[PDB]
């Protein structure tokens, strides 16, 4: 558990320091030194926007790809005794490719909105550009993570489907219904991401 | 004490190589080995005694630091200023010995 101990130690120290700094800035009555508006406005909307774009596509691939290996191993394993499996259970991987596509389309629709500002002083400059920036970040993150977990869901379920079909070919059709619900989870993330950027403009 | 004792240990090897009539072990072994150790480490020993008798408090400011000259010796590092030399011509001696 060497790595888990590392992750925990960093986690605890990371937040423990934030607690001490936060409470100290309060106690010592600093002149609003911890300025959230400063962080949000100085960070260029280009960072937020392009981060959301990369996440939207990249996280969706991670999900798809995760699920692919979940069902790949199960299908190949079962197929040792039931070669029929490859005929029908490949759709689980079709579902995983579909989960990745959701993110790809959304990522492109978002990236199509990317524009320069020719802006300098954030003060009273690009008010709407900041909204569009944050919205693009959110919508990108929204669909990315939603597809990420969607891909895992359909992968796990597809594994069960392959293991079921290996032993009884009549079970595939009934189980298929569950993966359809899984795919819907990813689509819901797409719908919200579209809405979040439905009224944005850059430039 | 360490360096002198080490030199003794090397000196003993000469008698053994003579006893077993191994000219090669003294013409290519002992001689360059004892010179190597002398030139680097015996030199250091001499300088240590030199400083004790060469410099008084009258020169305590910018008094040479033996450790720094020893390192600069090996590296052929001879800055124009920043370190006083122990004796005139030392630069030539330090370079020669290395």
């Amino acid at each position: 558990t060497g790595l888990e101990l590392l992750y925990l130690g960093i986690f605890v120290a990371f937040w423990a320091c934030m607690i001490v700094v936060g409470i100290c800035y309060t106690i010592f009555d600093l002149g609003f030194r911890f300025d959230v508006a400063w962080f949000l406005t100085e960070t260029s909307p280009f960072m937020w926007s392009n981060l959301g774009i990369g996440l939207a596509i990249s996280l969706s691939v991670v999900g798809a790809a995760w699920g692919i290996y979940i069902t790949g191993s199960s299908i190949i394993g079962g197929g040792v005794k039931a070669p029929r499996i490859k005929t029908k259970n490949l759709v689980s991987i079709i579902f995983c490719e579909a989960v990745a596509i959701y993110g790809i389309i959304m990522a492109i629709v978002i990236s199509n909105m990317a524009e320069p500002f020719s802006a300098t002083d954030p003060k009273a400059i690009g008010h709407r550009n900041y909204h569009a920036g944050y919205s693009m970040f959110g919508a990108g993150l929204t669909v990315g993570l939603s597809n990420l977990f969607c891909g895992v869901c359909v992968g796990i379920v597809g594994s069960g489907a392959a293991l079921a079909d290996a032993q009884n070919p009549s079970l595939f059709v009934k189980i298929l219904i569950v993966e359809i619900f899984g795919s819907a989870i990813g689509l819901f993330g797409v719908i919200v991401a579209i809405l979040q950027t439905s009224r944005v403009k850059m430039g | 004490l360490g360096i002198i004792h080490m030199l003794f240990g090397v000196s003993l090897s000469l008698f053994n190589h003579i006893y077993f009539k191994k000219p090669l072990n003294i013409y290519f072994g002992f001689i360059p080995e004892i010179i190597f150790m002398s030139s680097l480490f015996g030199y250091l020993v001499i300088l240590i005694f030199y400083k004790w008798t060469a410099y008084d408090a009258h020169s305590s400011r910018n008094a040479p630091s033996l450790l720094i000259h020893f390192i600069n010796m090996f590296l052929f590092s001879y800055p124009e200023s920043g370190n006083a030399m122990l004796y005139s011509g030392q630069k030539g001696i330090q370079c020669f010995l290395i």
Binding site: - | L1, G2, I3, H5, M6, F36, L40, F41
Partner: protein, 78 residues
Amino acid sequence: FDFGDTMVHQAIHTIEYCLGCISNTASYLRLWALSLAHAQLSEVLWTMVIHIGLHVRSLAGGLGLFFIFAAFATLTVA
């Protein structure tokens, strides 16, 4: 006559000799390191033990010094 092995063996001798001379000279820093430690352990054993056996009170000093020294003696040996 294995020329290759002889060259390797002699090369090893030179490498160990030269690097050893550097390390061996430093090794004798053991003489200082332990001499320093002994003096420091002795000083603290004196200062933090037998010093306490002395006092401006006459009788208390004499009787205490007996017991304190015995502890000092014990630690000195140990």
